[PDB]
Ligand binder design. Sequence first.
Ligand code: FES
Length: 106
Amino acid sequence: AKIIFIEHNGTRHEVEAKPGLTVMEAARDNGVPGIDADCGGACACSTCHAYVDPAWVDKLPKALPTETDMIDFAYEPNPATSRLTCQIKVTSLLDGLVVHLPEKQI
Ligand code: FES
């Protein structure tokens, strides 16, 4: 499944992620800039924050309270598109998924 990461300045990164991996790993394991992933996907740092593209938001599973609670600690979260990538699992049907990276991670 191809995952597309777009930095805030508009630089496009494309990665081929195997189903089962998380979006966070897809970016981390492939050297995509903008994702810190400090807690390693334990949904405790929120430094894997990103804005899912409006066109795909409805195709992802909805966020659980544990995740939503942690997004409020991310850098400039968006109630509509913000998500923690470590909480989104790649699946073949998400081939072509587009994610926009914030300017900073906290
Ligand atoms: S990488 Fe720590 S919250 Fe996702």
